[PDB]
Protein backbone atom coordinates (compact mmCIF):
# COMPACT_ATOMS: atom_id res chain seq x y z
CA UNK A 1 0.00 0.00 0.00
CA UNK A 2 1.02 3.63 0.44
CA UNK A 3 1.72 5.80 3.48
CA UNK A 4 -1.27 7.38 5.20
CA UNK A 5 0.72 10.19 6.81
CA UNK A 6 4.11 11.82 6.54
CA UNK A 7 6.51 10.63 9.22
CA UNK A 8 7.93 13.38 11.37
CA UNK A 9 11.57 14.25 11.90
CA UNK A 10 11.27 12.92 15.45
CA UNK A 11 10.27 9.39 14.46
CA UNK A 12 12.86 9.44 11.69
CA UNK A 13 15.52 10.48 14.19
CA UNK A 14 14.53 7.72 16.59
CA UNK A 15 14.98 5.28 13.71
CA UNK A 16 18.06 6.63 11.95
CA UNK A 17 20.08 7.27 15.11
CA UNK A 18 19.09 4.11 16.95
CA UNK A 19 22.20 2.27 18.17
CA UNK A 20 21.52 -0.75 15.96
CA UNK A 21 22.12 1.46 12.92
CA UNK A 22 25.24 3.22 14.22
CA UNK A 23 28.77 2.38 13.16
CA UNK A 24 30.52 0.40 15.87
CA UNK A 25 33.91 1.41 17.23
CA UNK A 26 36.38 -1.36 16.45
CA UNK A 27 38.11 -2.92 19.46
CA UNK A 28 40.69 -4.90 17.44
CA UNK A 29 43.10 -2.39 15.90
CA UNK A 30 46.71 -2.16 16.98
CA UNK A 31 50.24 -1.38 15.81
CA UNK A 32 52.61 -3.83 14.11
CA UNK A 33 54.99 -4.16 17.08
CA UNK A 34 58.11 -4.38 14.89
CA UNK A 35 57.12 -2.64 11.66
CA UNK A 36 55.00 0.05 13.36
CA UNK A 37 51.96 0.36 11.09
CA UNK A 38 48.28 -0.04 11.85
CA UNK A 39 46.68 -3.44 11.49
CA UNK A 40 43.85 -5.60 12.65
CA UNK A 41 44.82 -8.64 14.67
CA UNK A 42 43.57 -11.35 12.32
CA UNK A 43 44.76 -9.66 9.11
CA UNK A 44 48.08 -8.85 7.49
CA UNK A 45 49.81 -5.51 7.84
CA UNK A 46 48.61 -3.74 4.71
CA UNK A 47 51.88 -1.89 4.09
CA UNK A 48 53.95 -5.04 4.56
CA UNK A 49 51.67 -7.00 2.23
CA UNK A 50 51.94 -4.35 -0.46
CA UNK A 51 55.72 -4.30 -0.21
CA UNK A 52 55.64 -8.09 -0.59
CA UNK A 53 53.32 -8.03 -3.60
CA UNK A 54 55.60 -5.56 -5.36
CA UNK A 55 58.55 -7.95 -5.13
CA UNK A 56 56.41 -10.93 -6.09
CA UNK A 57 55.33 -9.04 -9.20
CA UNK A 58 58.91 -8.16 -10.12
CA UNK A 59 60.04 -11.77 -9.68
CA UNK A 60 57.13 -12.96 -11.78
CA UNK A 61 57.95 -10.46 -14.52
CA UNK A 62 61.45 -11.92 -14.67
CA UNK A 63 59.99 -15.43 -14.74
CA UNK A 64 57.80 -14.49 -17.68
CA UNK A 65 60.68 -12.85 -19.51
CA UNK A 66 62.69 -16.07 -19.16
CA UNK A 67 60.02 -18.66 -19.96
CA UNK A 68 59.35 -16.96 -23.30
CA UNK A 69 55.68 -17.67 -23.91
CA UNK A 70 52.75 -19.54 -22.40
CA UNK A 71 52.55 -23.23 -21.57
CA UNK A 72 56.04 -23.45 -20.08
CA UNK A 73 55.58 -24.53 -16.48
CA UNK A 74 59.02 -25.94 -15.58
CA UNK A 75 59.46 -29.41 -14.14
CA UNK A 76 62.00 -28.36 -11.49
CA UNK A 77 62.00 -26.11 -8.45
CA UNK A 78 62.93 -22.44 -8.74
CA UNK A 79 65.22 -20.18 -6.71
CA UNK A 80 65.56 -16.40 -6.92
CA UNK A 81 68.94 -14.77 -6.36
CA UNK A 82 69.75 -11.09 -5.93
CA UNK A 83 72.92 -9.23 -6.88
CA UNK A 84 76.21 -10.65 -5.67
CA UNK A 85 74.71 -13.99 -4.65
CA UNK A 86 76.26 -17.03 -6.28
CA UNK A 87 73.92 -20.05 -6.55
CA UNK A 88 74.30 -21.81 -3.21
CA UNK A 89 75.37 -25.44 -2.95
CA UNK A 90 71.76 -26.52 -2.40
CA UNK A 91 70.25 -24.73 -5.41
CA UNK A 92 72.06 -26.44 -8.29
CA UNK A 93 69.64 -28.04 -10.70
CA UNK A 94 66.99 -25.45 -9.85
CA UNK A 95 66.06 -22.66 -12.23
CA UNK A 96 67.61 -19.32 -11.27
CA UNK A 97 65.64 -16.08 -11.64
CA UNK A 98 68.23 -13.31 -11.43
CA UNK A 99 67.19 -9.93 -10.02
CA UNK A 100 69.16 -6.67 -10.07
CA UNK A 101 68.57 -5.13 -6.63
CA UNK A 102 69.97 -5.91 -3.20
CA UNK A 103 68.06 -8.62 -1.39
CA UNK A 104 65.40 -7.14 0.92
CA UNK A 105 66.13 -7.41 4.62
CA UNK A 106 62.76 -9.12 5.07
CA UNK A 107 63.59 -11.80 2.46
CA UNK A 108 65.07 -14.75 4.34
CA UNK B 1 12.81 43.76 -5.93
CA UNK B 2 9.58 44.72 -4.25
CA UNK B 3 9.33 48.50 -4.34
CA UNK B 4 9.09 50.17 -0.96
CA UNK B 5 10.89 51.53 2.10
CA UNK B 6 8.78 50.96 5.22
CA UNK B 7 9.23 47.20 5.47
CA UNK B 8 12.97 47.54 4.87
CA UNK B 9 13.42 50.02 7.70
CA UNK B 10 11.17 47.99 9.99
CA UNK B 11 13.27 44.89 9.33
CA UNK B 12 16.49 46.81 9.94
CA UNK B 13 15.16 47.95 13.31
CA UNK B 14 14.17 44.40 14.22
CA UNK B 15 17.62 43.14 13.21
CA UNK B 16 19.23 45.80 15.39
CA UNK B 17 17.02 44.72 18.29
CA UNK B 18 18.09 41.10 17.84
CA UNK B 19 21.72 42.22 17.57
CA UNK B 20 21.31 43.98 20.93
CA UNK B 21 20.30 40.73 22.67
CA UNK B 22 23.13 38.56 21.39
CA UNK B 23 26.36 40.44 21.90
CA UNK B 24 24.94 43.12 24.25
CA UNK B 25 27.24 46.12 24.61
CA UNK B 26 29.67 46.26 27.53
CA UNK B 27 27.74 48.05 30.28
CA UNK B 28 28.91 51.62 30.82
CA UNK B 29 28.42 54.36 33.38
CA UNK B 30 25.00 55.95 33.41
CA UNK B 31 26.93 59.22 33.66
CA UNK B 32 28.10 58.79 30.05
CA UNK B 33 24.96 57.78 28.17
CA UNK B 34 22.92 60.72 26.80
CA UNK B 35 20.48 62.71 28.95
CA UNK B 36 22.65 63.36 31.99
CA UNK B 37 23.27 66.43 34.12
CA UNK B 38 24.80 65.70 37.51
CA UNK B 39 23.29 68.64 39.39
CA UNK B 40 19.68 67.76 38.61
CA UNK B 41 20.37 64.11 39.34
CA UNK B 42 21.86 64.70 42.79
CA UNK B 43 19.14 67.17 43.75
CA UNK B 44 16.54 64.62 42.66
CA UNK B 45 18.35 61.99 44.71
CA UNK B 46 17.86 64.26 47.68
CA UNK B 47 14.20 65.08 47.11
CA UNK B 48 13.33 61.46 46.32
CA UNK B 49 14.11 60.16 49.80
CA UNK B 50 12.31 63.02 51.62
CA UNK B 51 15.54 64.39 53.07
CA UNK B 52 17.12 67.85 52.98
CA UNK B 53 20.71 66.93 52.25
CA UNK B 54 23.15 69.80 52.25
CA UNK B 55 24.19 69.97 48.62
CA UNK B 56 27.94 70.39 49.18
CA UNK B 57 28.26 67.58 51.71
CA UNK B 58 26.17 65.25 49.58
CA UNK B 59 28.30 66.16 46.57
CA UNK B 60 31.50 65.26 48.39
CA UNK B 61 29.88 62.12 49.82
CA UNK B 62 29.79 60.56 46.34
CA UNK B 63 33.44 61.24 45.44
CA UNK B 64 35.96 58.53 46.32
CA UNK B 65 39.73 58.56 46.70
CA UNK B 66 40.02 56.22 43.73
CA UNK B 67 38.37 58.82 41.50
CA UNK B 68 40.64 61.61 42.78
CA UNK B 69 43.75 59.53 42.13
CA UNK B 70 42.57 58.59 38.65
CA UNK B 71 41.83 62.22 37.83
CA UNK B 72 45.29 63.21 39.08
CA UNK B 73 46.94 60.52 36.95
CA UNK B 74 44.77 61.14 33.88
CA UNK B 75 45.55 64.87 33.80
CA UNK B 76 48.92 64.15 32.14
CA UNK B 77 39.20 69.05 46.15
CA UNK B 78 38.06 66.76 48.98
CA UNK B 79 37.42 63.02 49.31
CA UNK B 80 34.80 61.09 51.29
CA UNK B 81 36.91 59.24 53.85
CA UNK B 82 35.87 61.36 56.83
CA UNK B 83 32.16 61.30 56.00
CA UNK B 84 32.35 57.55 55.44
CA UNK B 85 33.92 57.02 58.86
CA UNK B 86 31.32 59.16 60.59
CA UNK B 87 28.49 57.40 58.79
CA UNK B 88 29.73 53.88 59.44
CA UNK B 89 30.34 54.60 63.11
CA UNK B 90 26.94 56.21 63.59
CA UNK B 91 25.22 53.42 61.66
CA UNK B 92 26.81 50.78 63.85
CA UNK B 93 25.88 52.60 67.06
CA UNK B 94 22.30 53.34 65.98
CA UNK B 95 21.63 49.83 64.70
CA UNK B 96 22.99 48.45 67.95
CA UNK B 97 20.63 50.70 69.89
CA UNK B 98 17.68 49.71 67.71
CA UNK B 99 18.26 45.98 67.99
CA UNK B 100 19.05 46.12 71.70
CA UNK B 101 15.83 48.00 72.45
CA UNK B 102 13.71 45.79 70.20
CA UNK B 103 15.30 42.49 71.32
CA UNK B 104 16.46 42.82 74.92
CA UNK B 105 17.29 39.20 75.71
CA UNK B 106 19.52 38.61 72.70
CA UNK B 107 23.23 38.35 73.60
CA UNK B 108 25.74 40.95 72.52
CA UNK B 109 27.34 38.45 70.13
CA UNK B 110 24.05 38.03 68.28
CA UNK B 111 23.35 41.76 68.15
CA UNK B 112 26.82 42.41 66.78
CA UNK B 113 26.26 39.69 64.18
CA UNK B 114 22.95 41.20 63.05
CA UNK B 115 24.59 44.62 62.89
CA UNK B 116 27.38 43.22 60.74
CA UNK B 117 24.84 41.54 58.46
CA UNK B 118 22.77 44.67 57.89
CA UNK B 119 25.84 46.86 57.40
CA UNK B 120 27.60 44.20 55.33
CA UNK B 121 28.34 44.28 51.64
CA UNK B 122 25.69 41.72 50.73
CA UNK B 123 22.83 43.97 51.88
CA UNK B 124 24.37 47.42 51.55
CA UNK B 125 25.15 46.81 47.87
CA UNK B 126 21.56 45.68 47.34
CA UNK B 127 20.17 48.80 49.02
CA UNK B 128 22.65 50.98 47.13
CA UNK B 129 21.87 49.68 43.65
CA UNK B 130 18.12 50.16 44.19
CA UNK B 131 18.54 53.79 45.28
CA UNK B 132 20.78 55.04 42.46
CA UNK B 133 24.03 55.39 44.41
CA UNK B 134 26.02 53.62 41.71
CA UNK B 135 24.75 56.06 39.09
CA UNK B 136 25.98 59.14 40.95
CA UNK B 137 29.12 57.77 42.62
CA UNK B 138 32.49 58.49 41.02
CA UNK B 139 35.05 55.70 40.76
CA UNK B 140 37.29 53.90 38.27
CA UNK B 141 35.79 50.49 37.57
CA UNK B 142 32.19 50.03 36.47
CA UNK B 143 30.28 48.25 37.92
CA UNK B 144 31.52 49.90 41.11
CA UNK B 145 32.96 47.20 43.42
CA UNK B 146 30.60 46.36 46.29
CA UNK B 147 33.09 47.66 48.86
CA UNK B 148 33.15 51.07 47.19
CA UNK B 149 29.36 51.13 47.09
CA UNK B 150 29.29 50.30 50.79
CA UNK B 151 31.70 53.06 51.73
CA UNK B 152 29.88 55.59 49.53
CA UNK B 153 26.51 54.61 51.00
CA UNK B 154 27.76 55.21 54.51
CA UNK B 155 29.34 58.45 53.32
CA UNK B 156 25.85 59.51 52.22
CA UNK B 157 24.45 58.56 55.62
CA UNK B 158 27.23 60.62 57.17
CA UNK B 159 26.29 63.63 55.07
CA UNK B 160 22.66 63.14 56.08
CA UNK B 161 23.66 63.08 59.74
CA UNK B 162 25.88 66.15 59.55
CA UNK B 163 23.06 67.97 57.74
CA UNK B 164 19.73 67.11 59.39
CA UNK B 165 20.76 65.76 62.79
CA UNK B 166 20.64 62.37 64.52
CA UNK B 167 16.92 61.63 64.64
CA UNK B 168 16.30 61.98 60.91
CA UNK B 169 19.31 59.80 60.18
CA UNK B 170 17.87 57.22 62.56
CA UNK B 171 14.64 57.27 60.60
CA UNK B 172 16.62 56.82 57.37
CA UNK B 173 18.41 53.78 58.80
CA UNK B 174 15.13 52.35 60.08
CA UNK B 175 13.67 52.87 56.62
CA UNK B 176 16.34 51.23 54.45
CA UNK B 177 18.64 49.00 56.50
CA UNK B 178 16.43 47.59 59.27
CA UNK B 179 13.73 46.75 56.73
CA UNK B 180 16.08 44.13 55.28
CA UNK B 181 15.41 41.90 58.28
CA UNK B 182 11.95 41.26 56.86
CA UNK B 183 11.21 37.57 56.54
CA UNK B 184 14.75 36.45 57.31
CA UNK B 185 15.04 34.02 60.19
CA UNK B 186 17.59 34.67 62.91
CA UNK B 187 20.15 32.05 61.91
CA UNK B 188 20.06 33.12 58.27
CA UNK B 189 21.77 36.36 59.30
CA UNK B 190 23.62 35.18 62.43
CA UNK B 191 25.44 32.20 60.91
CA UNK B 192 26.47 29.86 63.73
CA UNK B 193 27.75 26.30 64.17
CA UNK B 194 27.16 23.84 66.98
CA UNK B 195 23.84 25.23 68.24
CA UNK B 196 23.37 22.74 71.07
CA UNK B 197 26.56 23.98 72.70
CA UNK B 198 25.34 27.56 72.66
CA UNK B 199 21.98 26.47 74.06
CA UNK B 200 23.71 24.65 76.91
CA UNK B 201 25.87 27.69 77.63
CA UNK B 202 22.90 30.06 77.76
CA UNK B 203 20.87 27.65 79.89
CA UNK B 204 23.79 27.33 82.31
CA UNK B 205 24.00 31.12 82.61
CA UNK B 206 20.37 31.03 83.77
CA UNK B 207 21.34 28.29 86.26
CA UNK B 208 19.39 25.33 84.90
CA UNK B 209 20.72 21.91 83.98
CA UNK B 210 21.44 21.15 80.34
CA UNK B 211 18.38 20.05 78.37
CA UNK B 212 17.39 16.44 77.83
CA UNK B 213 16.64 15.52 74.23
CA UNK B 214 13.77 13.06 73.82
CA UNK B 215 11.87 11.68 70.82
CA UNK B 216 8.40 13.18 70.63
CA UNK B 217 7.10 11.73 67.36
CA UNK B 218 8.33 9.55 64.51
CA UNK B 219 7.12 8.22 61.18
CA UNK B 220 8.91 5.99 58.72
CA UNK B 221 11.69 4.72 60.96
CA UNK B 222 13.22 2.32 58.44
CA UNK B 223 12.51 4.00 55.11
CA UNK B 224 14.63 6.54 53.24
CA UNK B 225 12.19 9.39 53.97
CA UNK B 226 11.81 9.40 57.76
CA UNK B 227 10.36 12.12 59.96
CA UNK B 228 11.63 12.49 63.52
CA UNK B 229 10.19 15.15 65.84
CA UNK B 230 12.72 15.67 68.64
CA UNK B 231 11.67 17.65 71.70
CA UNK B 232 14.08 19.12 74.23
CA UNK B 233 13.00 19.19 77.87
CA UNK B 234 14.12 21.05 80.98
CA UNK B 235 13.12 19.23 84.17
CA UNK B 236 9.91 17.71 82.76
CA UNK B 237 8.86 20.89 80.88
CA UNK B 238 9.19 21.31 77.13
CA UNK B 239 11.19 24.24 75.78
CA UNK B 240 11.29 23.43 72.05
CA UNK B 241 10.42 20.90 69.37
CA UNK B 242 12.11 20.32 66.04
CA UNK B 243 11.55 18.30 62.88
CA UNK B 244 14.08 16.43 60.82
CA UNK B 245 14.92 13.31 58.88
CA UNK B 246 17.74 12.09 61.11
CA UNK B 247 17.41 12.25 64.86
CA UNK B 248 20.63 14.25 64.94
CA UNK B 249 19.19 16.88 62.60
CA UNK B 250 15.94 16.97 64.57
CA UNK B 251 17.91 17.57 67.77
CA UNK B 252 19.90 20.33 66.07
CA UNK B 253 16.70 22.01 64.91
CA UNK B 254 15.19 21.68 68.38
CA UNK B 255 18.24 23.49 69.68
CA UNK B 256 17.78 26.20 67.05
CA UNK B 257 14.13 26.76 67.93
CA UNK B 258 14.91 26.81 71.66
CA UNK B 259 17.62 29.39 71.03
CA UNK B 260 15.18 31.50 69.04
CA UNK B 261 12.55 31.31 71.79
CA UNK B 262 15.03 32.33 74.47
CA UNK B 263 16.42 35.18 72.37
CA UNK B 264 12.98 36.54 71.47
CA UNK B 265 13.35 36.16 67.69
CA UNK B 266 10.57 33.72 66.92
CA UNK B 267 8.67 33.58 63.63
CA UNK B 268 5.62 35.19 65.26
CA UNK B 269 7.37 37.95 67.19
CA UNK B 270 5.82 41.39 67.51
CA UNK B 271 6.60 42.80 64.05
CA UNK B 272 8.85 45.82 64.04
CA UNK B 273 6.93 49.07 64.53
CA UNK B 274 7.70 51.42 61.64
CA UNK B 275 4.99 54.00 62.34
Amino acid sequence: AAPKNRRTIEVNRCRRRNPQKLIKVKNNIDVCPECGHLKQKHVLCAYCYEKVCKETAEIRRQIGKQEGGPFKAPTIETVVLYTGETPSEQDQGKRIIERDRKRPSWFT
Amino acid sequence: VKKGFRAAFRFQKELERQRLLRCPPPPVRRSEKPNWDYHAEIQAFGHRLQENFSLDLLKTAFVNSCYIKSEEAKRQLKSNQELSEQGTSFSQTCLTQFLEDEYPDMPTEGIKNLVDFLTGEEVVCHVARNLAVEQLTLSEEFPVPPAVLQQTFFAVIGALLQSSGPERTALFIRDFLITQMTGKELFEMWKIINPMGLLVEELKKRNVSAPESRLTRQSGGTTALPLYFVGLYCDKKLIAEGPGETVLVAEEEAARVALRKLYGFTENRRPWNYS
Binding site: T8, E10 | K2, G4, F11
Partner: protein, 139 residues
Protein backbone atom coordinates in the same frame (compact mmCIF):
# COMPACT_ATOMS: atom_id res chain seq x y z
CA UNK C 1 2.89 44.12 -10.51
CA UNK C 2 1.54 47.39 -9.15
CA UNK C 3 1.00 46.62 -5.46
CA UNK C 4 2.61 43.72 -3.64
CA UNK C 5 2.52 43.16 0.09
CA UNK C 6 6.00 44.19 1.20
CA UNK C 7 5.61 43.15 4.85
CA UNK C 8 4.11 39.67 4.93
CA UNK C 9 7.05 38.70 7.13
CA UNK C 10 5.78 40.62 10.14
CA UNK C 11 2.25 39.31 9.78
CA UNK C 12 3.67 35.80 9.83
CA UNK C 13 5.91 36.45 12.84
CA UNK C 14 2.95 37.89 14.74
CA UNK C 15 1.52 34.37 14.74
CA UNK C 16 4.70 32.30 14.90
CA UNK C 17 5.95 34.15 17.98
CA UNK C 18 3.07 32.54 19.86
CA UNK C 19 4.07 29.08 18.65
CA UNK C 20 7.82 28.86 19.27
CA UNK C 21 7.05 26.70 22.30
CA UNK C 22 4.91 24.20 20.40
CA UNK C 23 6.07 20.75 19.34
CA UNK C 24 6.39 19.49 15.78
CA UNK C 25 6.19 21.09 12.39
CA UNK C 26 3.40 23.24 13.80
CA UNK C 27 5.87 25.61 15.43
CA UNK C 28 7.46 26.84 12.20
CA UNK C 29 4.90 26.15 9.44
CA UNK C 30 2.27 28.87 9.35
CA UNK C 31 -0.55 26.73 7.93
CA UNK C 32 -0.48 24.60 11.08
CA UNK C 33 0.75 27.16 13.58
CA UNK C 34 -2.33 29.27 12.92
CA UNK C 35 -4.82 26.52 13.67
CA UNK C 36 -3.08 25.39 16.83
CA UNK C 37 -2.48 28.95 18.04
CA UNK C 38 -6.15 29.73 17.55
CA UNK C 39 -7.11 26.64 19.51
CA UNK C 40 -4.62 27.73 22.15
CA UNK C 41 -6.17 31.17 22.56
CA UNK C 42 -9.71 29.77 22.56
CA UNK C 43 -8.75 27.42 25.38
CA UNK C 44 -6.96 30.31 27.11
CA UNK C 45 -10.19 32.31 27.08
CA UNK C 46 -12.47 29.43 27.98
CA UNK C 47 -10.20 28.25 30.80
CA UNK C 48 -10.79 31.10 33.24
CA UNK C 49 -14.20 29.68 34.09
CA UNK C 50 -12.56 26.37 34.90
CA UNK C 51 -9.88 28.16 36.89
CA UNK C 52 -12.50 29.54 39.23
CA UNK C 53 -14.35 26.22 39.40
CA UNK C 54 -11.17 24.26 40.13
CA UNK C 55 -9.80 26.55 42.81
CA UNK C 56 -13.18 26.40 44.51
CA UNK C 57 -13.23 22.61 44.41
CA UNK C 58 -9.67 22.49 45.76
CA UNK C 59 -10.72 24.73 48.63
CA UNK C 60 -13.72 22.56 49.34
CA UNK C 61 -11.43 19.52 49.42
CA UNK C 62 -8.89 21.11 51.75
CA UNK C 63 -11.65 22.34 54.04
CA UNK C 64 -13.19 18.87 54.07
CA UNK C 65 -9.83 17.40 55.05
CA UNK C 66 -9.25 19.92 57.83
CA UNK C 67 -12.79 19.63 59.15
CA UNK C 68 -12.55 15.85 59.15
CA UNK C 69 -9.37 16.18 61.20
CA UNK C 70 -11.73 17.52 63.91
CA UNK C 71 -14.53 14.97 63.69
CA UNK C 72 -16.82 17.25 61.69
CA UNK C 73 -17.93 16.83 58.08
CA UNK C 74 -17.97 19.68 55.59
CA UNK C 75 -21.76 20.08 55.34
CA UNK C 76 -21.78 20.79 59.07
CA UNK C 77 -18.95 23.32 59.04
CA UNK C 78 -20.33 25.61 56.35
CA UNK C 79 -23.99 24.99 57.00
CA UNK C 80 -23.48 25.93 60.64
CA UNK C 81 -20.90 28.69 60.46
CA UNK C 82 -23.39 30.81 58.53
CA UNK C 83 -25.97 30.06 61.19
CA UNK C 84 -23.48 31.86 63.45
CA UNK C 85 -23.34 34.77 61.00
CA UNK C 86 -19.66 34.40 60.08
CA UNK C 87 -19.24 35.27 56.41
CA UNK C 88 -15.77 33.79 56.03
CA UNK C 89 -15.50 32.47 52.49
CA UNK C 90 -13.80 29.28 51.36
CA UNK C 91 -10.47 30.66 50.16
CA UNK C 92 -9.76 32.06 53.61
CA UNK C 93 -11.12 28.97 55.33
CA UNK C 94 -8.60 26.86 53.41
CA UNK C 95 -5.81 29.32 54.19
CA UNK C 96 -6.71 29.17 57.88
CA UNK C 97 -6.77 25.37 57.83
CA UNK C 98 -3.28 25.19 56.35
CA UNK C 99 -1.53 28.14 57.96
CA UNK C 100 -3.36 28.71 61.27
CA UNK C 101 -4.40 25.34 62.69
CA UNK C 102 -5.64 26.53 66.07
CA UNK C 103 -7.84 29.26 64.63
CA UNK C 104 -9.42 26.61 62.43
CA UNK C 105 -9.75 24.40 65.50
CA UNK C 106 -11.74 27.18 67.13
CA UNK C 107 -13.94 27.64 64.07
CA UNK C 108 -14.67 23.91 64.02
CA UNK C 109 -15.52 24.05 67.71
CA UNK C 110 -17.90 26.92 67.02
CA UNK C 111 -19.57 24.98 64.22
CA UNK C 112 -20.02 21.92 66.42
CA UNK C 113 -21.40 24.13 69.18
CA UNK C 114 -24.00 25.65 66.87
CA UNK C 115 -24.89 22.22 65.48
CA UNK C 116 -25.51 20.93 69.00
CA UNK C 117 -27.59 23.99 69.83
CA UNK C 118 -29.73 23.37 66.77
CA UNK C 119 -30.26 19.71 67.62
CA UNK C 120 -31.17 20.56 71.21
CA UNK C 121 -33.60 23.27 70.14
CA UNK C 122 -35.35 21.15 67.52
CA UNK C 123 -35.56 18.26 69.99
CA UNK C 124 -37.46 20.42 72.48
CA UNK C 125 -41.13 21.36 72.68
CA UNK C 126 -41.83 24.93 71.60
CA UNK C 127 -39.66 28.06 71.64
CA UNK C 128 -37.62 27.51 74.81
CA UNK C 129 -34.80 30.06 75.17
CA UNK C 130 -32.55 30.07 72.14
CA UNK C 131 -28.99 28.84 72.25
CA UNK C 132 -26.28 31.17 73.46
CA UNK C 133 -24.71 31.18 69.99
CA UNK C 134 -27.93 30.81 67.99
CA UNK C 135 -29.03 34.42 68.59
CA UNK C 136 -29.05 36.41 65.37
CA UNK C 137 -27.74 39.97 65.16
CA UNK C 138 -29.86 42.24 62.98
CA UNK C 139 -28.64 45.03 60.72
Amino acid sequence: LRNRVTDRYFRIQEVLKHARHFRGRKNRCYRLAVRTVIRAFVKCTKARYLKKKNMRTLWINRITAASQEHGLKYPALIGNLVKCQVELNRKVLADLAIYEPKTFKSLAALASRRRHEGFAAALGDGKEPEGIFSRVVQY
